[PDB]
Design an enzyme around this catalytic site. Structure first.
Site, PDB file in Angstrom:
ATOM      1  N   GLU A  22      26.857  37.146  42.695  1.00  0.00           N
ATOM      2  CA  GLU A  22      27.690  37.373  41.487  1.00  0.00           C
ATOM      3  C   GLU A  22      27.523  36.287  40.414  1.00  0.00           C
ATOM      4  OE1 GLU A  22      29.343  39.990  40.981  1.00  0.00           O
ATOM      5  OE2 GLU A  22      29.723  40.905  42.932  1.00  0.00           O
ATOM      6  N   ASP A  31      29.011  42.429  32.731  1.00  0.00           N
ATOM      7  CA  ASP A  31      28.134  42.531  33.919  1.00  0.00           C
ATOM      8  C   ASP A  31      27.045  43.579  33.651  1.00  0.00           C
ATOM      9  OD1 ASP A  31      29.004  45.145  34.391  1.00  0.00           O
ATOM     10  OD2 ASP A  31      30.088  44.656  36.263  1.00  0.00           O
TER      11      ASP A  31
END
Ligand SMILES: C=CCc1ccccc1O
Length: 175
Positions: A22, A31
């Protein structure tokens, strides 16, 4: 393996694993699917409105952040999100028996998958669940590679798929 290489598994755990997949970002960002995120993969909201995201942020941290947090705050939110994924597996009648059957490393990959997709997303993989319980690792990995989760954002999911295939930490080596 050298004495050091044999030590590498004791340095890996779910927090180190998700931290690699992540990243760590102290400012709000989008993202790979374009959703506002912060910290260590904390999805703030799916709305395109940056205003919801900042409001969700201040809620989660409990202060006026204006889109920016500290490393310690990132860690805290992350630990909460990890706890939520593990708790989500253990209370679920379909996921818990499969999780219990897995070895420790594949259990980490399961918590990582839930952290990324959510409980109902993962529990929909009817076939991969049966494959994992039957230790059909190659087949489970090929079937996870068909999913939108992996194909829409391969770099975030690829290490988790390899870890289901092998039950080792090798995909997290040599960054
Ligand atoms: C079905 C994919 C992997 C998986 C197994 C068990 C529990 C959670 C989970 O995400």
């Amino acid at each position: 393996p050298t004495t050091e290489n044999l030590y590498f598994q004791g340095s890996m755990n779910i927090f180190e694993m998700l931290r690699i997949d992540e990243g760590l970002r102290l400012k709000i960002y989008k993202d790979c699917e374009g959703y506002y995120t912060i910290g260590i993969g904390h999805l703030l909201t799916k709305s395109p409105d940056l205003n919801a995201a900042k409001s969700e942020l201040d809620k989660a941290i409990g202060r006026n952040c204006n889109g920016v947090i500290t490393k310690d705050e990132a860690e805290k939110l992350f630990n909460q999100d990890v706890d939520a994924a593990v708790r989500g597996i253990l209370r679920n009648a379909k996921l818990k028996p499969v999780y219990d059957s897995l070895d420790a490393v594949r259990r980490c990959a399961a918590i990582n998958h839930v952290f990324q997709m959510g409980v109902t997303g993962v529990a929909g993989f009817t076939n991969v669940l049966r494959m994992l319980q039957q230790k059909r690792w190659d087949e489970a990995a090929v079937n996870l590679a068909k999913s939108r989760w992996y194909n829409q954002c391969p770099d975030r999911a690829k290490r988790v798929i390899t870890t289901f295939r092998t039950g080792t930490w090798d995909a997290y080596k040599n960054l």
